[PDB]
Amino acid sequence: KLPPGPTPLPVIGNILQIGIKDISKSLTNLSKVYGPVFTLYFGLKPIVVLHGYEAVKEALIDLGEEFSGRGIFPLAERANRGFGIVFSNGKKWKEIRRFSLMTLRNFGMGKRSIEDRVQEEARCLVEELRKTKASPCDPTFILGCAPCNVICSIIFHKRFDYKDQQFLNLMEKLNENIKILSSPWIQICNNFSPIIDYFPGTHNKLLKNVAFMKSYILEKVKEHQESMDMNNPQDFIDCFLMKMEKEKHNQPSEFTIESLENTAVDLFGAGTETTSTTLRYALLLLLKHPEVTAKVQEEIERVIGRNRSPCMQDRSHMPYTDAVVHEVQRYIDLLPTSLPHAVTCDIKFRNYLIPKGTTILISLTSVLHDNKEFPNPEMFDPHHFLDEGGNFKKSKYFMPFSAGKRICVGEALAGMELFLFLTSILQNFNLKSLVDPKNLDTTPVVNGFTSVPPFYQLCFIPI
Ligand code: HEM
Ligand SMILES: CCCCc1nc(Cl)c(CO)n1Cc1ccc(-c2ccccc2-c2nn[nH]n2)cc1
Ligand SMILES: CCCCc1nc(Cl)c(CO)n1Cc1ccc(-c2ccccc2-c2nn[nH]n2)cc1
Ligand SMILES: CCCCc1nc(Cl)c(CO)n1Cc1ccc(-c2ccccc2-c2nn[nH]n2)cc1
Ligand SMILES: [K+]
Structure with missing residues (x-):
């Protein structure tokens, strides 16, 4: 049988009982009644929730293959999203993911490293920040340009000037779609309608925005097909075309210009909002806890100095800053319920049987805010990742990127972006708040499955 859960109602299951304001809090409430594994019904669609480290670990890690599916809902069909990596399944997923991971290794795309691309972007980021001339600033836009440009550089090999209009169009389309996808109407309510789409104009805008991106990618791809040097692949496209070559004699192949376009859009979608938000939240928490910022700066001064860019090598000698980055991630809990999964076969879990x-x-x-692993999980505190000697303290419960x-x-990539961008910023600036560090609230603003920071402004004061 399935795991226990609140008795669903006829037809709507458990829908009218789950506080949609903050699904995560609701799931936690439920776990206080039904335990670490329970079922909920969306219509007659059952959904098994895993709550707590032990349950998540045995599922995601111990029975990893069985839980490697991506749960699909009507929205997947409606915004054409099951044809790259994030929303794929089976062989298509395995091959594209595998290829993707290899291509994204630090030196997976030629002599120019991922680190180098990030470092260059950090340089540009500091520059654009300087241009604010220390005036009040809503850093949303600037912080979003950086991670986006890193993807651009990984995919097209070229970064854009922050005012190159083709860059500005890309970001606009991305931002639009993200905002849309973040509406509870689109995340929740539209998924009740199994076969009929109630927000047709919206799904049309989404697709239109994608079309524009894919059509920009397509042009880059033609340019790349032209100047193809087989022995010197320089970006994700070069690599994808080279994989295509090895595939000839393997029809049909998972690697096609179509899947390339789709994969590249996924990278843009997955690689630019979460990192960007996490950067934005970090600055806010640093404004709120200036003593933390000061210590990060003391480590930057001592380990890196002012005569050179930060680099990944510096991380191991900067336990405190490392602890800070980790803590930001843990505290903010950006993807409270990750992305939905689905079992790949009939499986026995604990005492239950979960159908394929x-x-x-x-x-x-539940993992990130585990109250024993992280006392006072609701408070921001770098000491959560530090030992008595001030050394970095790793945690099995550190899962902001999920597990399995x-x-x-982008685990590694995000890591580099956070560390390098944050160190760079604080190497060249002090942060000044408009209001008083005692007034601003840093509590996340939850809306359905989304969790973001509140609005704020600050001044980047050159050192
Ligand atoms: C702070 C930044 C980021 C966070 C917190 C984050 C977190 C996550 C999470 C929670 C998932 C869901 C995994 C699951 O199904 O269990 C995910 C998926 C993914 N992330 Fe990110 N991510 C970040 C940045 C990036 C970046 C920069 C990339 C760029 C390569 C990226 C690429 C992906 C991809 C492709 C997936 C889909 C994985 C799959 O289905 O196999 N992410 N990310
Ligand atoms: C009918 C095909 C038009 C598609 C489209 N492309 C762009 Cl671009 C626009 C700008 O609104 N649009 C139209 C659009 C119209 C209404 C919405 C919308 C906004 C808020 C709340 C509900 C809707 C909605 N979507 N579908 N029906 N109502 C979204 C996009
Ligand atoms: C020009 C188009 C902008 C981005 C974009 N809009 C559409 Cl629609 C897609 C397909 O899902 N995408 C790609 C997309 C791929 C993955 C995600 C995803 C990746 C990791 C974690 C959460 C997200 C997510 N899914 N929905 N909203 N944000 C977001 C966007
Ligand atoms: C194909 C899309 C499936 C997503 C979905 N539809 C419904 Cl209905 C459910 C939950 O009843 N869910 C679970 C879910 C929905 C959206 C997200 C999401 C979308 C954009 C950005 C962040 C998130 C996120 N993932 N986990 N928490 N928040 C995450 C989980
Ligand atoms: K309409």
């Missing part, structure tokens, strides 16, 4: 294809919802919040076979492809 059943949707699985993982509570990352579906773990974030």
Whole structure:
């Protein structure tokens, strides 16, 4: 049988009982009644929730292959999203993911490293920040340009000037779609309608925005097909075309210009908003806890100095800053329920039997805010990742990127972006708040499955 859960109602299941304001809090409430594994019904669609480290670990890690599916919902069909990496399944997923991970290794695309691309972007970021001339600033836009440009550089090999209008169009389309996708109407309510789409104009805008991006990618790809040097692949496209070559004699192949376009859009989608938000939240928490910022700066001064860019090598000698980055991630809990999973076959879990294809919802919040691993999990405190001697203290509960076979492809990349961008900023600036560090609230603003920071402004004061 399935795991227990609140008795669903006829037809609507458990829908009218789950506080949609903050699904994560609701799942936690439920776990207080039904335990670490329970079922909920969306219509007659069951969804098994895993809550707590032990349950998430055995599912995602111990029974990893069985829980490597991506749970699909009507929205997947409606915004054409099952044809790259994030929303794919089976062989298509495995091959594209595998290829993607290899291509994204630090030196996976030629002599120019991922680190180098990030470092260059950090340089540009500091520059654009300087241009604010220390005036009040809503850093949303600037912080979003950086991670986006890193993807551009990884995919097209070229970064854009922050005012190159083709760059500005890309970001606009991305931002638009993200905002749309973040509406509870689109995340929740539209998914009740199994066969009929109630927001047709919206799904049309989404697709239109994608079309524009794919059509920009297509042009870059033609240019790349032209100046193809087989022995010197320089970006994700070069690599993807070279994989295509090895595939000839392997029809049909998972690698096609279509899947390339789709994969590249996924990278843009997955690689630019979460990192960008996490950067934005970090500055806010640093404004709120200036003593933390000061220590990060003391480590930057001592280990890196002022005569050179930060680099990944410096991280191991900067336990405190490392602890800070980790803590930001843990505290903010950006993807409280990760992305939905689905079992790939009939499976026995604990004392229950979960049928193949059943949707699985993982509570990352439950792990990240584990009250024993992280006393006072609701408070921001770098000491959560530090030992008595001030050394960095790793945690099995550090899962902001999820865990298992579906773990974030960008785990390493995001790590580099956070560390390098944050160190760079604080190497060249002090942060000044408009209001008083005692007044601003840093509590995340939850809306359905989304969790973001509140609005704020600051001044980047050159050192
Ligand atoms: C702070 C930044 C980021 C966070 C917190 C984050 C977190 C996550 C999470 C929670 C998932 C869901 C995994 C699951 O299904 O269990 C995910 C998926 C993914 N992330 Fe990210 N991510 C970040 C940045 C990036 C970046 C920069 C990339 C760029 C390569 C990226 C690429 C992906 C991809 C491709 C997936 C889909 C994985 C799959 O289905 O196999 N992410 N990420
Ligand atoms: C009918 C095909 C038009 C598609 C489209 N492309 C762009 Cl671009 C626009 C700008 O609104 N649009 C139209 C659009 C119209 C209404 C919405 C919308 C906004 C808020 C709340 C509900 C809707 C909605 N979508 N579908 N029906 N109502 C979204 C996009
Ligand atoms: C020009 C188009 C902008 C981005 C874009 N809009 C559409 Cl629609 C797609 C297909 O999902 N995408 C690609 C997309 C791929 C993955 C995600 C995703 C990746 C990791 C974690 C959460 C997200 C997510 N899914 N929905 N909203 N944000 C977001 C966007
Ligand atoms: C194909 C899309 C499936 C997503 C979905 N539809 C419904 Cl209905 C459910 C939960 O009843 N869910 C679970 C879910 C929905 C959206 C997200 C999401 C979308 C954009 C940005 C962040 C998130 C996120 N993932 N986990 N928490 N928040 C995450 C989980
Ligand atoms: K309409």
